[PDB]
Structures are given as C-alpha cells and as structure tokens.
Design a protein around this ligand. Structure first.
Ligand SMILES: Cn1cnc(Cn2c(=O)nc(Nc3cc4cn(C)nc4cc3Cl)n(Cc3cc(F)c(F)cc3F)c2=O)n1
Ligand SMILES: Cn1cnc(Cn2c(=O)nc(Nc3cc4cn(C)nc4cc3Cl)n(Cc3cc(F)c(F)cc3F)c2=O)n1
Lengths: 299, 297
C-alpha cells in the first residue's frame, strides 16, 4: 500500500510554456486554448499588488509567447476567467484528451504533474486539505502545474497551482480560476485557516492497514457516531457523517470490521497515542487516502 | 518532502499485453521487440515447477498474442534470454523513446508504472531494498510492469516485475531477465533475506534536513569509513561503498558538511536515539530518498 498517482501521459502532452515580458510559467493546452495563471501578465512590481483587469487591458496578443516543446504557438486571442487567463492559439493540440473541469471537495485526492518551464518533472498524489491548501512538492517555476483524476481515459482537471504560502503549503485554483480557499493571486504573505484532519480518510487508511495484515490498533470496544464525533472534534478531526459511514461500507464488508468499531479503534489511537508503533510504516495517522483510493489499490 | 515519480507517458506508450493460452501479463514494446516475463508460457500446472526450455520448444510464433490495446501485433520471432521472453513483432513502436537497460544497486530508487493486462493504472516511486526486494503496490495481473528513471528524455529501464513474496514484498529482474536477489521465476514459496537500512539514503535525508535549517544532530565528531561501517552493521544498517561516498559529494559540498562528519552524526543517532526530537518533522529516519532525489527536491 503506497501513495499512487494516475499515469500522466495524457496530461504531459498538454503542458506548455507561457511568457509575458520576463515573467514565465506553465500552461495547459486543450484544443485551441491555453489555460494558465493570470499572474503571468505581472512584472515583478505588478506582482506585489496587481490590478488584473487594468493590466490585461494594456496587453496585446503578441505580448504572449507560448512554447509547446520547441515549437511556438501564435496567440490569436486572449481573455480572463477569474484567476485563469485563456489564450486562444492558432493550432489545436492534436493530443487533447477527453477531459472535464471539476471542482473537488476537501478530502478528495488528485494527481499532481509538477512542471517547470513547460517540461513535466514529476507526478505525485495530493489531497485537498479541509483548509483548502495542499501539501505538495513545488519549486520556483511550477506556477501553472495541474492536478487531475483519470476515470476511463477521461481526465478531470481539478487544480492549477499558483503559490507557496509562508508555511510551505500550496494554494491554487480550479480551472474556472476560482481559488480553493480564501487566498488571492498576489505576492503577499498569506496564512491559511487552521487545518484539521480528514477523518473518513484516516478510517480508510486503517482499513487498508487491516487488508495488508496489520491489526495491532483494533480493539473490542464500539462507539456511537455522536460519541466518536465528540472526541474527533476535540482533536481537530473533521466530523464523520452518515454518508461517510456509507462510503466506508465496502471496506467494512471486505474486512468484516464495522465502521463504528474502526471509529472506536481510531478514538483510542487519538487518546492514547501510537506508543511508538507504526501503521503501514508511518508514525502518524495518514489522512490523504480516500476510501476510493484504498479500494482501487486493494482490489 | 514527498516521494515523486517521473512522468510516465514515455513508458505508457510502450506497454502491451502478452497472452499465451490463458496466461496473460504485461510486456514492453521498444522498436520491433516486445520484452516480458517468460512465465507467460506457463499454464496453471506449469507455474509450480516449470521447465522453460521444454516449454519454449512446444511454442511457435503463432502461439503468442501481443496486443497494443485491442490491436494485435504479429509475432515474427521469439527467443528467451534468462527470465525474459523477447518477441520480435512486425511493427516498430513509433513512440519508442531514447532508452537504456540498466541494472541498479540496492538503495537506488525508480518509478514503477503498475499495469494490468497491458493497461497502465498507476505510478509511484520505489527503492530497491538491500535484500533485493521492493516494497511495491501490485495486484494480480501486474507481472511485466516495469520500473524506470528518466534523465533528459532518456528512459533507463531497471526493473521488470515478476512475483510477490509471502511477506508481501515484490521481486523481479532487470531488462535482460537477470533476477535481483536470490529468486527464480517459479510459483514456489521464496522468502526475502533479512533486510537492512539503506545508510547512504539516511545520510541524504540528513543532508536534506540540514539544507532546510534542521541541524541539531550535527556534532563535533568525525569518523573513518571503516570504523563507521563496522558500527553500522551492528545496528542493521548497510555498510557504505566508495560509490556511496561519492554520490553524497554534491550534498556535502552544498552544505559544507564532510561526508565522514555526517556519518559521525548518524552514528550518534544510532547509539543514543533521537531522545524525543524530530528530524524534518519525523521521529523515524527515512531511507528511500537517494542523494539525487534530495537534490531534485
Ligand atoms: C517556491 N515555490 C513553490 N511553488 C511555487 C510556485 N510559484 C511560482 O512557480 N512562481 C511564483 N512567482 C513567479 C516568479 C517569476 C519570475 N519569473 C522570471 N517568472 C515568474 C513567474 C512567477 Cl508565477 N510564485 C509566486 C506567486 C505566484 C502566484 F501565482 C501568485 F498569485 C502569487 C505569488 F506570490 C510561486 O508561488 N514556488
Ligand atoms: C498480488 N500480486 C502482486 N504482484 C503480483 C504479480 N504476479 C502476477 O501478476 N501474476 C502472477 N502469476 C500469473 C497468474 C496468471 C493467471 N492468468 C490467467 N495469467 C497469469 C499470469 C501470471 Cl504471471 N504472479 C505469480 C508469479 C509470477 C511469476 F512471474 C513467477 F515467476 C512466479 C509467480 F508465482 C505474480 O506474482 N501479484
């Protein structure tokens, strides 16, 4: 049981470089549109406090250099949708996959294709934290990198990377250009709200640990849903809903451990700590696996 | 600090499925040759004690079903090299990347493209353990999945997946079909050797912490390499090689911390513990990040 990302080939074929002046970052080339963060129109003075509509109206199509590998694409039009700039180019991407734009919910996961100057560099899994940040691995030049899920060869794009926060966590937008979270595309120190743990995911990962032959954390006790949620909230875990209990059904079915039995197990781990032991080789309670991620990998 | 796979597209367009009778697994299509585990020529009753020489003699080109998706690639020649079958097909793969076949050493990491019936399903980074297993994540139908590194658009293939072991770890070969470790391609109960901690990678991890300002564990001591190797084995850590000291060179230069000074630091952590302090926010020493991985991140 490992963190596993989707195969990234369908997305790699879509990554390009966008440059405006000296400012440069990654864009996503779908059919005859390149999507990228609007931040690319900013000079370094602009970045500190940008008025984007005002900066964009003073831009021309020829102010935009788009490179797909070694070839240049000619921008024939441009517009802005919230924090995303849409560059119309004169050539369709012939490797455009079947795709959708989706906005994911906190707790859901997606694969990140990290890119630098339009070249893909790595791929890994992230989750949308409950405070709408993600804990990724991004360096300078990764602006415009995208997150995505793939189901039956259709790519669902859900994240476009924008900035690193002072705490090292990451903030971005969906592909309509709305930020996840209360952030803005400005170069100024921004804090996130207090983060909490994705409870249903921790439960999924405990089930994974059982499917993989580890049970030291299980106990005899059971709890009620409300009594478990009291303890969870006390430890800054998100509440567990009855929908979450239902989503965990197959994993309870497969292992024969009732969900509220697993909750009783998690409750004790939260109160008594891990006492030095490890679950799936981790010393902390892992919360970036969804029930689907666990199912997809154990079956 | 995350485990990061290489982008997988160059390898995705090389994955095919190979079927013999009802036995089906994954193969790798490069130019006009498909490479796959020879275990594919086994029926159920052959997998326990297969006679690969006598099984290949009953076989003709027309016994091999090779498919890119649902498209058949006609097999025009077949031969065995160690534990991999090489199938000559009538079509050169137009998406063949610039590639090499390499044999990796324990501690080196690589990306695994897990596949089922010729269809990629996931990608993740693995380290080769000192007992020549990998802590993979593989389901049934993953035989023939490959592991790789990508350097400047060149794909270096280093691993082809064959089997899961009772302990739940995995074993395979290089792309010339030579197993890593003391395993053989039979459906027999084989046990991984006792594993050890990858010392060069723990050191890389310590350099990563120092680069990030987390350096409490640095001490005023130094050691010789032989002295350190003899003590590391007593804590079930791998001894360091001359090549290991050299790939730590860039990190040693970046931080100004001599490789042997960092060994003395680790030796002190081995003999006394972390005493309740963390390194990169962790109480445990990570050993699956190589020095190259550390600098890449
Ligand atoms: C350390 N880190 C982790 N993730 C990131 C992503 N990131 C980025 O890649 N680039 C940024 N600013 C730029 C500077 C440029 C210099 N040149 C020549 N071209 C540049 C292009 C960019 Cl985008 N930023 C900062 C940043 C980007 C934003 F989109 C934003 F709204 C606010 C910000 F403060 C950045 O975080 N770096
Ligand atoms: C759970 N798991 C994790 N890794 C693996 C890898 N693995 C595999 O995918 N398949 C195997 N045996 C086959 C059975 C088949 C049934 N049909 C219809 N077709 C089949 C093809 C194969 Cl390869 N094995 C077992 C195995 C494969 C070998 F190559 C070998 F030398 C010895 C072995 F015991 C397997 O481990 N499964």
């Amino acid at each position: 049981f490992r963190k596993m990302a989707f195969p990234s080939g369908k997305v790699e074929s879509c990554m390009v470089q966008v440059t405006c002046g000296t400012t440069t970052l990654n864009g996503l080339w779908l059919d005859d549109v390149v999507y990228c963060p609007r931040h690319v129109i900013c000079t370094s003075e602009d970045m500190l406090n940008p008025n984007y509509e005002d900066l964009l109206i003073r831009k021309s199509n020829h102010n935009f250099l788009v490179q797909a590998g070694n070839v240049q694409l000619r921008v024939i039009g441009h517009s802005m949708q919230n924090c995303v700039l849409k560059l119309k180019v004169d050539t369709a991407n012939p490797k455009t996959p079947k795709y959708k734009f989706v906005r994911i919910q906190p707790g859901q996961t997606f694969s990140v294709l990290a890119c630098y100057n339009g070249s893909p560099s790595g791929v890994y899994q992230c989750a949308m934290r409950p405070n709408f940040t993600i804990k990724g691995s991004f360096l300078n030049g990764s602006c415009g990198s995208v997150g995505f899920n793939i189901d039956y060869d259709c790519v669902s794009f859900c994240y476009m990377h924008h900035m690193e926060l002072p705490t090292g966590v990451h903030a971005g937008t969906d592909l309509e250009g709305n930020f996840y979270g209360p952030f803005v595309d400005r170069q100024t120190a921004q804090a996130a709200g207090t983060d909490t743990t994705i409870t249903v995911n921790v439960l999924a990962w405990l089930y994974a640990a059982v499917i993989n032959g580890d049970r030291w954390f299980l106990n005899r006790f059971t709890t009620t849903l409300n009594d478990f949620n009291l303890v969870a909230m006390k430890y800054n875990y998100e509440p567990l809903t009855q929908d979450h209990v239902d989503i965990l059904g197959p994993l309870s079915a497969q292992t024969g451990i009732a969900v509220l039995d697993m909750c009783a197990s998690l409750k004790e781990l939260l109160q008594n700590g891990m006492n030095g032991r490890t679950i799936l080789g981790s010393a902390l309670l892992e919360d970036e696996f969804t029930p689907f991620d666990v199912v997809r990998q154990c079956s």
